């Protein structure tokens, strides 16, 4: 169990840690989050009470260092920082726990939600999508654009998702225009899995990270990436059976966790209707089709 201490909370803010959130008042004696499960990536996220346009946060893994939050009154945001002095850090954490100024990561023992959403997400791959090599943790916010979005302006602050484009040279073999456009198996299996991702775990890890960035930050380009990676599997006639079974589990937990009020902006009607009802895989996502039909029958 690990700890992310806070220097202070000078501004009223809704703090998120993974799928949980709590409201902190201006200058409320709040010194952080304890009992954070080791073995998973985590995301701490922020929405200012004054400016709900400040939706932003930090992907981190407690195994990679000692991380804390401190408010920057100049840049006007809660910043993540690494403490390299292990002894100063243990010291600070012990004192705030003793004074019980920390909230407990509020996990139910039976509850595998966060594991299920982050199964294939690894901090090393996050740091390749979000490039800032001096830090061990990755900043994401609502406004950040994707490399693909930027092709159609600041490259330092972009999300480096794998470019997927169904009407591209990469996607289509010359002489196989109709075959490759109607059956994307070539693009999925040779170009993306064997060529770029190397395996289905890396592919799923990017799909899950894209989803979580869409859900927690309302990051529009992440939503596009999540739908594109789903559509590329659903539009492929030839997909390994283990990948179909795992995709069904992945999507089930994403749809289960999505806030009901956000389904209208976060879910693309066309992709879902095509994946569940029209595509090669219309009969391969049993768990996903049942939760979608029971939770979002309107969208379909």
């Amino acid at each position: 169990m690990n700890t992310v201490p806070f220097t202070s909370a000078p501004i009223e803010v809704t703090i998120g840690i993974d799928q949980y959130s709590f409201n902190v008042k201006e200058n409320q004696p709040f010194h952080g989050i304890k009992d954070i499960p080791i073995g998973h990536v985590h995301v701490i996220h922020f929405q200012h009470a004054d400016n709900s346009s400040m939706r932003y946060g930090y992907w981190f893994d407690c195994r990679m260092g000692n991380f804390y939050i401190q408010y920057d009154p100049k840049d006007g945001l809660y910043k993540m920082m690494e403490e390299r002095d292990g002894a100063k850090f243990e010291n600070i954490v012990h004192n705030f726990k003793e004074r019980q100024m920390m909230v407990s990561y509020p996990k139910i023992d039976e509850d595998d939600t966060w594991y299920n959403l982050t199964e294939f997400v690894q901090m090393d791959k996050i740091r390749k999508i979000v490039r800032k090599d001096e830090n061990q943790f990755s900043y994401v916010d609502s406004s950040m654009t994707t490399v693909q979005e930027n092709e159609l302006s600041d490259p330092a602050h972009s999300l480096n998702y794998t470019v997927i484009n169904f009407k591209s040279r990469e996607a289509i073999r010359p002489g196989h225009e109709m075959e490759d456009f109607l059956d994307k198996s070539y693009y999925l299996n040779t170009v993306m899995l064997q060529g770029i991702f190397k395996n289905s775990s890396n592919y799923f890890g990017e799909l899950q990270f894209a989803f979580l960035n869409a859900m927690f930050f309302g990051n529009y380009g992440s939503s596009l990436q999540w739908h594109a990676m789903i559509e590329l599997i659903c539009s492929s006639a030839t997909v390994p059976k283990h990948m179909l079974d795992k995709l069904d589990e992945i999507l089930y937990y994403q749809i289960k966790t999505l806030p009901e009020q956000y389904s209208d902006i976060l879910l693309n009607e066309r992709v879902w209707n095509i994946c569940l009802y029209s595509s090669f895989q219309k009969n391969s996502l049993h768990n996903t089709e049942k939760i979608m039909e029971n939770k979002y029958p309107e969208l379909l």
Binding site: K167, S168, R169, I172, P174, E177, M178, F181
Partner: protein, 237 residues
């Protein structure tokens, strides 16, 4: 974007463009089998690829052999159309390649887009116009070369005959669309109007009769009357 009534004059500027109509690519007769089931028999088809400025028509004949042993032929027909338009473009010298291709049916956008992926500078456009190019197979000489074909063939025509010697492209396109609209609405009546006066013949190298300027005005009037009559009957107006 979409080609419509508003942006009509763009057809007649000096940017090379082609209309592609795929209506007559996949053509069938529907008949009863011995057992009383229904079957199709394909007949020869064509791609209607037209430069509306010059009148140059690239008629790609689609021989029934293309369909042998293929499934989902109405879908294949769209891809076969895109493949052949793609091959036509690559056969043309650079300075003759189109800057836009306008498809008469939106279902041709994705097939042509994918076939022309490596021509990023050629715009593939739909249209809001309901152009009567389906009626091309009502032009006797075009119907004749399609139905006689024993193999895949490209035949080159000028669908304006020699009209550009006397009228603008705008006027030539308006006459072409009026003739084809008439042929589509009432083929028998349209044909009677064009071929009645036996002293006005079709030159060996032409598709349409050798009307004088005054005779075209009479013909055009008779075609417009025919179209509005049939509109009356159709809608009981």
């Amino acid at each position: 974007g979409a080609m419509n009534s508003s942006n009509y004059a763009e057809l007649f500027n000096n940017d090379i463009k082609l209309f592609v109509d795929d209506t007559n690519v996949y053509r069938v007769t529907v008949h009863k089998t011995f057992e009383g089931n229904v079957a199709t028999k394909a007949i020869n088809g064509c791609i209607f690829t037209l430069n509306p400025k010059t009148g140059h028509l690239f008629l790609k004949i689609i021989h029934t052999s293309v369909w042998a042993g293929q499934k989902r032929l109405s879908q294949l027909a769209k891809w076969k159309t895109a493949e052949e338009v793609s091959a036509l473009v690559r056969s043309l010298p650079k300075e003759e390649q189109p800057k836009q291709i306008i498809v008469t049916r939106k279902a041709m956008l994705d097939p042509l887009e994918v076939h022309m992926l490596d021509f990023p500078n050629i715009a593939i456009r739909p249209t809001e116009l309901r152009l009567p190019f389906s009626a091309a197979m009502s032009i006797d000489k075009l119907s004749d070369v399609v139905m006689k074909a024993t193999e895949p063939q490209m035949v080159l025509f000028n669908i304006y005959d020699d009209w550009l010697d006397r009228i603008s492209s705008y006027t030539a396109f308006s006459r072409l669309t009026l003739l084809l609209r008439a042929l589509k609405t009432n083929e028998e009546s349209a044909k009677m109007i064009l071929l009645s006066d036996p002293t006005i013949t079709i030159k060996s190298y032409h598709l349409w009769p050798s009307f004088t300027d005054e005779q075209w005005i009479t013909i055009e009037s008779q075609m417009r009357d025919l179209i509005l009559t049939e509109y009356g009957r159709k809608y009981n107006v």
